[PDB]
């Protein structure tokens with residue numbers, strides 16, 4: 001992370017985040033939780049919001065570095081996302097699948 | 107990739123893939139393309155099927171290795187997927203947003 005443009009970041013939040021998040025202290029939850037005080041806190045802990053199983057599966061102390069990686073692809077931390085288009089968690093499942101597919105497709 | 111179980115792989119296809127793919131020669135397209143002969147071709151060129159922009163973005167001659175990685179998370183290669191929950195392409199976009207969010211959330 002390198003410090004960038006807070007003005008451009010504001011426009012980004014408004015057009016990319018605001019539809020599911022508020023950020024001001026005491027702001028309401030929406031589809032996603034209010035993000036006030038998120039950087040001095042652990043993930044999956046906003047008062048008054050109950051998260052998916054994502055927050056018992058991974059747990060970070062938010063900072064610029066780990067949030068930058070999060071925001072690369074937040075959808076993959078939402079359970080169900082990977083399975084929706086055929087994603088397979090277990091490497092053995094993927095081996096098994098491919099072994100069959102190589103035969104079934106020839 | 108290690109050779110695995112074609113019978114377990116077959117149950118996996120039926121329950122995880124079949125809803126969007128067929129595999130037999132001459133099989134119909136569904137939401138996704140028929141996969142006959144997939145291991146003998148490049149990605150994104152099944153006859154009679156027209157793909158998302160994913161196939162002018164990423165290109166691969168399919169084999170066990172690169173399809174194992176694909177099947178880790180296929181939804182990642184569908185355009186729109188990352189953006190849907192606030193995903194940010196550009197590093198500088200991410201930098202800008204975090205710079206703003208650190209202030210906005212204090």
Ligand code: HEC
Pocket residue numbers: 012013016017018019020021031032033035038042043044045046050051052053054055067071074077078190191192193194203207
């Ligand atoms: C725009 C770029 C953003 C940013 C900066 C964030 N989001 Fe979201 N968010 C959504 C949902 C449903 C959740 C909960 C996920 C779950 O329960 O598994 C989240 C969570 C977050 C976090 C973590 C919050 C915490 O308390 O740890 C963060 C940092 C975050 N978001 C930032 C939903 C959405 C959207 C719905 C369509 C959209 C759009 C965004 N988020 C976009 C962004």
Ligand code: HEC
Pocket residue numbers: 084085086087097101118119122123124125126127137138139141144148149150151152156157158159160161173177180183184
């Ligand atoms: C279950 C485990 C599987 C497996 C083995 C595969 N899929 Fe899918 N698939 C879907 C869509 C819409 C596409 C095209 C995406 C695009 O146009 O960008 C695909 C594509 C593939 C490929 C590549 C095909 C090629 O010719 O290169 C492969 C190898 C593949 N799939 C395997 C849609 C879906 C689903 C819809 C809900 C589901 C479920 C799956 N796919 C699951 C699987």
Ligand SMILES: OCCCCCCC1CCCCC1
Pocket residue numbers: 043044051054055058059060066067069070077
């Ligand atoms: O590895 C960098 C991303 C870590 C994501 C942490 C999970 C988080 C829990 C609750 C809210 C959704 C995502």
Ligand SMILES: OCCCCCCC1CCCCC1
Pocket residue numbers: 149150157160161164165166172173175176183
């Ligand atoms: O690094 C992983 C390589 C796999 C890329 C798969 C691209 C494919 C092209 C068009 C159809 C779906 C995705």
